[PDB]
Amino acid sequence: KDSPIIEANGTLDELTSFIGEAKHYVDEEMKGILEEIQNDIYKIMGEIGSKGKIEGISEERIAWLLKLILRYMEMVNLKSFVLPGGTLESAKLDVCRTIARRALRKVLTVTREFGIGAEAAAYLLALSDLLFLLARVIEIEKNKLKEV
Amino acid sequence: KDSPIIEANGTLDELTSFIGEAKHYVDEEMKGILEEIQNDIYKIMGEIGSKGKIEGISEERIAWLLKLILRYMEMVNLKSFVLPGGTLESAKLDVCRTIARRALRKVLTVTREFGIGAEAAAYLLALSDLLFLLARVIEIEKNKLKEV
Amino acid sequence: KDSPIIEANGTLDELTSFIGEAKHYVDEEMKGILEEIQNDIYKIMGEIGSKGKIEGISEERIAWLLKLILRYMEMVNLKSFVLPGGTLESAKLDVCRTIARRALRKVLTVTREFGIGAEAAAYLLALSDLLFLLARVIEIEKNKLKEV
Amino acid sequence: KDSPIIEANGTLDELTSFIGEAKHYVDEEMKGILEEIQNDIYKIMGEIGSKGKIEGISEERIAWLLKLILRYMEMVNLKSFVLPGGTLESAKLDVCRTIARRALRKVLTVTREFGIGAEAAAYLLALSDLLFLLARVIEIEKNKLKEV
Amino acid sequence: KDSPIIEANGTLDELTSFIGEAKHYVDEEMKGILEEIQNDIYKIMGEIGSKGKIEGISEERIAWLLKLILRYMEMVNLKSFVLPGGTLESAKLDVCRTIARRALRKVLTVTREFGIGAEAAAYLLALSDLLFLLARVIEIEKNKLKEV
Amino acid sequence: KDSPIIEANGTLDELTSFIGEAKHYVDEEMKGILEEIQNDIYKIMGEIGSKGKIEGISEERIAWLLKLILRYMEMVNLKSFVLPGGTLESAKLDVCRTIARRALRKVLTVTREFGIGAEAAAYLLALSDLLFLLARVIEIEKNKLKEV
Amino acid sequence: KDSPIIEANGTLDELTSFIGEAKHYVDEEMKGILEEIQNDIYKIMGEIGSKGKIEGISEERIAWLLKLILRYMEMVNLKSFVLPGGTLESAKLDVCRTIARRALRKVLTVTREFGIGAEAAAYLLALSDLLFLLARVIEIEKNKLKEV
Amino acid sequence: KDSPIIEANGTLDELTSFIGEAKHYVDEEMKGILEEIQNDIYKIMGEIGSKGKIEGISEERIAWLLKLILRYMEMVNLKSFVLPGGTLESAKLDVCRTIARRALRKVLTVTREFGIGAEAAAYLLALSDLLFLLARVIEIEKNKLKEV
Amino acid sequence: PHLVIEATANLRLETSPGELLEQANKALFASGQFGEADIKSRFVTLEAYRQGTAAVERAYLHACLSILDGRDIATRTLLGASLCAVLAEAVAGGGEEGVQVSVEVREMERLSYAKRVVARQ
Amino acid sequence: PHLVIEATANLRLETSPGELLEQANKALFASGQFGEADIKSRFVTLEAYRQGTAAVERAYLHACLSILDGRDIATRTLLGASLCAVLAEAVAGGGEEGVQVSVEVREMERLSYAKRVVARQ
Amino acid sequence: PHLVIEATANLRLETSPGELLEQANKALFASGQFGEADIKSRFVTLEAYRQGTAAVERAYLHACLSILDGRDIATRTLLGASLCAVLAEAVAGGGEEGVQVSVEVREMERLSYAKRVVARQ
Amino acid sequence: PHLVIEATANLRLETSPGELLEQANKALFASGQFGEADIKSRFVTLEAYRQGTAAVERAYLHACLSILDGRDIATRTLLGASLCAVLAEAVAGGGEEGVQVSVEVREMERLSYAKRVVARQ
Amino acid sequence: PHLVIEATANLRLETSPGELLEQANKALFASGQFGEADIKSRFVTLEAYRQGTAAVERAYLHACLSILDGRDIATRTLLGASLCAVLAEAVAGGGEEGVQVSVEVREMERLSYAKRVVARQ
Amino acid sequence: PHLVIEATANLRLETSPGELLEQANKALFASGQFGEADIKSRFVTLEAYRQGTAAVERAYLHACLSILDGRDIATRTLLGASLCAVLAEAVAGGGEEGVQVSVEVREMERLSYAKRVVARQ
Amino acid sequence: PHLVIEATANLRLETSPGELLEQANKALFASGQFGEADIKSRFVTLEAYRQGTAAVERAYLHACLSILDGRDIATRTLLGASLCAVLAEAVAGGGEEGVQVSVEVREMERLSYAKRVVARQ
Numbered sequence A, B, C, D, E, F, G, H: 001k002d003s004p005i006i007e008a009n010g011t012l013d014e015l016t017s018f019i020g021e022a023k024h025y026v027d028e029e030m031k032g033i034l035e036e037i038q039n040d041i042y043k044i045m046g047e048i049g050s051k052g053k054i055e056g057i058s059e060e061r062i063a064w065l066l067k068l069i070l071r072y073m074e075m076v077n078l079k080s081f082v083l084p085g086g087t088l089e090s091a092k093l094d095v096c097r098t099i100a101r102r103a104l105r106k107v108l109t110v111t112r113e114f115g116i117g118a119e120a121a122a123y124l125l126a127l128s129d130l131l132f133l134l135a136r137v138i139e140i141e142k143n144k145l146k147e148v
Numbered sequence I, J, K, L, M, N, O: 001p002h003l004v005i006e007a008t009a010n011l012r013l014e015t016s017p018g019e020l021l022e023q024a025n026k027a028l029f030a031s032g033q034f035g036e037a038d039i040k041s042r043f044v045t046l047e048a049y050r051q052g053t054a055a056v057e058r059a060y061l062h063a064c065l066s067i068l069d070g071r072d073i074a075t076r077t078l079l080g081a082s083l084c085a086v087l088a089e090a091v092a093g094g095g096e097e098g099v100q101v102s103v104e105v106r107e108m109e110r111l112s113y114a115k116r117v118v119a120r121q
Helices: A003-022 A028-049 A059-073 A088-114 A118-142 B003-022 B028-049 B059-073 B088-114 B118-142 C003-022 C028-049 C059-073 C088-114 C118-142 D003-022 D028-049 D059-073 D088-114 D118-142 E003-022 E028-049 E059-073 E088-114 E118-142 F003-022 F028-049 F059-073 F088-114 F118-142 G003-022 G028-049 G059-073 G088-114 G118-142 H003-022 H028-049 H059-073 H088-114 H118-142 I017-029 I073-090 J017-029 J073-090 K017-029 K073-090 L017-029 L073-090 M017-029 M073-090 N017-029 N073-090 O017-029 O073-090
Strands: I002-008 I011-013 I040-046 I048-051 I060-068 I091-094 I099-108 I114-118 J002-008 J011-013 J040-046 J048-051 J060-068 J091-094 J099-108 J114-118 K002-008 K011-013 K040-046 K048-051 K060-068 K091-094 K099-108 K114-118 L002-008 L011-013 L040-046 L060-068 L091-094 L100-108 M002-008 M011-013 M040-046 M048-051 M060-068 M091-094 M099-108 M114-118 N002-008 N011-013 N040-046 N048-051 N060-068 N091-094 N099-108 N114-118 O002-008 O011-013 O040-046 O048-051 O060-068 O091-094 O099-108 O114-118
Touching (some): A003 A028, A003 B088, A059 I017, A059 I073, A088 I073, A118 I073, B003 C088, B028 B118, B059 B118, C003 C028, C088 M073, C118 M073, D003 F088, D059 D118, D059 K017, D059 K073, D088 D118, E003 E028, F088 F118, F118 N073, G003 G088, G028 G059, I017 I040, I017 K048, I073 J114, I091 I099, J017 J040, J017 J073, J048 K017, J073 J091, K002 K011, L017 L073, L073 L091, M002 M011, M017 M040, M073 N114, M091 M099, M114 O073, N002 N017, N017 N040, N048 O017, N060 N073, O002 O011, O017 O040, O073 O091
Parallel strands (some): I002 I040, N002 N040, O002 O040
Antiparallel strands (some): I048 J040, J002 J060, K011 K091, L011 L091, M011 M091, M048 N040, N011 N091, N048 O040, O002 O060
């Protein structure tokens, strides 16, 4: 297959693998959320892998992230920049956040070349924003906010 | 040195480093297997790093993986696709599996440009297949198969 | 923004995220060192992200790493090559070491194209050398040096 | 520095130099106007010369030219095309008008390549239109309109 | 419009503007000649500006210059090279001569790319030769021939 | 001939023509200096025009400018930036200064492509610096320094 | 220097060296002719070596070869093609003939790229034709014409 | 293999073959020298042929030529240029000299592309200088110096 | 950025136009792409409208987000999907069939864009 | 696709705005480019308007067709010429001189375009 | 060209909408880019509007100039800066803080652009 | 350079062929492109000639300037226009209609061009 | 590699020149780029020196590291920053103002580089 | 920048080494390229030297200006010609023939260049 | 060209520095690349030096040939190998181990290079 396709699918496969590790360091609530993300990533990989032939994620899946983002934005009201991984648990999420953005860079290459994955790219962007919030929430509860 | 060479060697160095972390979450049997892989990767890095001058892995090393693959294929008979990291231990292996495929993508670039690393590329491909099986085996023993 | 800039900043953001995880597996001394590195990386990301407009790290920050390198070089006098991750703690550092070199490859692309990040590139190079020493020190104290 | 930058700054420096000569052939009113233009050009050269780092002219400066253009448009109501330099005084302005458009061509190259100087380009365009009107006004007062 | 067209028309507009200034430093005879040139330049700008659609100058206009060239060649019989601008009046013509050749360089670009302006290019070439003769004639009458 | 050669020679011919005009607005001392420059430019045009075959200016000619620069630097000690053409006389020199730098840009193209005119380029650079000083000196004597 | 120049001069230097060997296998008449050719080649190498600055051979030198060609054409009236080197002496000339044509190929590259050596190329072409005739003449006198 | 490699090795093989012929026309002293050169060429061909893997000539081999060059330079003190092959014996050396320079041109292509053969290129350059001296020495002893 | 929401007169919403605009601005600000006071949105009711050629009672809801160029396609797609979510949840019903909701994201030329602040406070 | 028709208040039409929109949709559907229910058009009367600087009674009629990118220039030109024909024949008169009728065809970014169907039936 | 001016209902102007449009057309004609009768501008008051998420009384003034493609960026920038000057000087006040004034210059596709003159005079 | 002038036998000139050649050489030398003694021109009268297919008395005057390559198109065009001016003013009349005057400028290959001076003085 | 350290005569150091060279070699070896015995450094005291045109007592410390080409810019920058750290900490004081410390890293052509070992042991 | 002047022991100068360095710094500062305190120059007398192979009494004067890269070739050439002028006028005599004066301008890699100020004042 | 030879103080040579420079110049002239009087070489003894970090008595001999650019890599390599041969044969011994001999060939920028002859004879 095409190299941009292979690289994007591989990075996505890496993303869900790191998420699969991080979900053993979060509560039962976030674990259910991360597992939903894993299913979405699987659906995304099918779209990109089939070069657009197989349907990817729906519009509601992106709207689902935004529901969570708006929800956790009310819990996170920090001003100064913070150092990643205030706690071990949040550190796992900060890692997944960066892998998600790395997946985004690969998908954007596919979109700019093959014209597919625009929906998936938007998902990964919102995903990284959610993983940021989820990481800060954990640090807030345990009060381990390390600032610059 | 050449950028494709440097990138391949770096990714391989990253692969064996993640394997070096995962081997502290597996039993003594898989730990011995992963440490053998680390030695092979070291031998591979010497080949690629020297741009083909130094001999890489032998044919038997690839045949060694296939011995293990055929062995663990009899223990893994799943039909439906599964979510990576059913357990924390298997999650480490799923990560290493994706890093191995990322190393494969870098090595293939070297092979297509310099004409070396074909043997190494085959090894990494079989390695990723073994790491997949090893991850599912752990999940099977603890019965934590999460499906899509 | 420019793709080389975005990729470099993303990889740097990934580096400090892995460091943020590794610092929960080291003593209080190395934890303070790793957190200083996180602040430097943050300062580096500002330089690269602003395409050179915002001042990066100072010369003393590079000299700070060399102070530590020369310090830990007296504790590490191994001859034969060793397998990464003799202990779980050192394995975290070996990972960060490889991510740091991956960040270096991205920054070098920026330097060769935009003419910025030379100071930052030198920092990441010395950083990877320090993370190597820090990993071996931990293995030495617990006597878990696995050789090839 | 970059050749398009150097050429643009040089041509602008030439423009204000010709204006500096023409202002000794106009009344005290136009002399004050031309000297304001020289200050604007100086501010423009700083923007282009610093490759966008230093702030250029404000929006009001462009609006200032349009105030003058609308003002002198009521004094100039010619139909047929006229030969440049009906008088010696107006000839100086006709020269400056053409140099201004030559500066515009250089700045446009910078804008299309570096993405800066759009404001400055608009200024030079309006400047050339004002210098046209100022030249015709002088010819009108002395009644030396030479037509084609 | 096309950049070669815009640049050529601008330089021509600059040429007639400098001529418009120089004609206030010559006698009534040369002033009438320079004003005829201004009309020709205006006709040329229409041809180039319309990318060949509008008719340019006629063959007789070129023949008109040659009539003047042959006429003033009988008055100018110098051997050694001379420094431009023996007098202030002739200096104006020497300037116009160089601007005319600069216009010629721009027009030639149009001719080599769009296949128009060959007639105009010949005119500007002969124009520069005439402006040379006219400048030397003035210097001869006042006896201010400065040689190298 | 080659276009970079033709353009450079034309711009140089334009430079000495503007100098030939400016020398009628200066005292007898500066007039002698400007006429020496005209002879040097003529010698430069021969070098560039012959594509390096004919010898250009000597090393002493550049040293001659530096003698004048160091001389007039003691008379000019301004801090703030000034607007070109405080007086009509100095305005002529400010124009010539900009034309000289425009000639420099053309010559540099020749040097970077044909490997000739390095000496000439240095001359034009020093020439522009001298013309700057000469312009400020005139403004100083009449006390017409217009600042930004 | 430029590679086409260096290669042409080298091949010419090789040509006159082979001629210098062949002249010890011919009579005193042809020896004088070959030595004249060596002087011409030396004059040619100066032209090509100096990239056209130094004058090459004159028109009479080419006319000199044609005098000899027409002269020996009356002695050579063969129809069928012959095998090179009927005698040892003629074999030396057949070699020089082929080296001369090899020199011609190199010179033509210079002519097509730098626009010099057209005269020299014509000389080498006529030279090869003369060396052909001179070789056949020797074979004719000893009656050793080997045909295909 | 690569064409530049093949061509260089072929030309070198041709050089030692011509030397192998010339050594039957020299005294026992020069014959021993030429045979040493043949061994060096053989060592050079191994280096270039193996694309740098096999070690080429040592530094002393180049120093060996310079010992001979300085030695025969004391015997050759001619001013005017001479025609190649004053004698039959020297003509053989003049041929080898030109073949050596042709080999040099091929090796330089390898060096500029693959970064190997710099030592070998220096050897061939000095070799050609020695073959020049050796040829003139023979002509001097028999007094057959033919000049231009 | 500039947001324009167009709704047919026969379209029923779960909220008032003002409440809909507030929800839209919150969604846009949630992207972290724009400053708060820069988000300028407006709502317009369409009185004269036709959807197709068929004689069926229909109602549609369209939005057009105009932002300055520079953002990648991932951001532009996310913004559109964000607004479309807000608009869809606001629709109560309209016509005698399904209501089509659409959101367009277009880019304004930044270099020629003019902006000033008057009556400053 | 989205069609917006703008008419000055002093412009007189041969048909009602609703009838004009129906004719426009029929012309758009006649291209065979769009689905029937996808053609969403609207009509707006301009109350505040100025045409030029002259003191002459004037009236103009403008339309803007927004379609998703992909179609060639032949299709885009045909669509514009199609709408312009419908608009021109609808004009009865306006002002004290000729009425300028114009139609613009612009392209919406398909990849970032969001579309949903709510209150489904 | 087509000019559309949008102003919030709570925005106070120094002139009437009609006077503002006349000033805008004079500024556009002052560029010498367009024919007089081709400058077609309109003014619209926004009744439903929200600026941001904050609870602060705000008012904004936006304009959108649509011209046929062909002009360089210097001309497009000048036109925008020209309109922005007219709009800024027209603003008397609005809300309880500064009023944001913005002008966008966009390009219409010339080749697919349709134009006719009906009821000719 | 080489100049060849061809004139039909029925063409009347204001000057003799020799005087025409002298005027032509002066015009060529006035370009400052050639050395004086290098300008080699000749005149030929055409005895057998036909202009077209019509049965109309016609006469034409053609010239062909051959110069070595190197000069730009501005110089080549100027030379042709220069010769055409001389030729046109020399024509007194011919045939029963207008006389067509034409001048061609062609380039000789410089690199293969051979030139010598014999019987030197 | 070759290291040359230049210090003005009026510059005071915290260590002897020999001790400074040893510290410099340790820093260079700490890069893991060079073999131990390959690091060849030297120290030179400048007796005749001028820093600028001003009449101020000044002292500077400059170093020049010459290495064979091949290393990336990250390595070259690190080496320079490494030497500059050693040199800066060695400076005790000089002149009547701040002491400028500078380090240059240049590359030697490897292919033309000659190296031998004589009096071998 | 760094300037190093080398003079053979048998070379006689019109000025002292210190005076020569001051003149050199004034010439360098006259270019307006460098800050005053950044011009760091030094003078060295060569005790062991040979010029050629001939047995003739000779003396030479060489200078090497090292500047950070970025300046064009016109500036580099001017700087060299500037220093060469100062050096030439300083030479009184040397050897039994003409004295060769030479100036080299080389560029230091800016990106790897390290610079600090210690004992600050 | 300019040749600079550097030798540690503890290095013993078979010849005097002057004799070494003469041998070096003969080798350089033997290349036929330079004029005789243009070969300007110098010898410097290093008093402060450290070779590595080990506590072993060491001595090294380094040379740096600076020539104007233009020569191919074959010539540059030959020149370096030529000087290295002369330097190696001159070494008698030094330290308690082998003596490292190295020669660098660098290129000076010809276009900015300044050269004059003063006190001419």
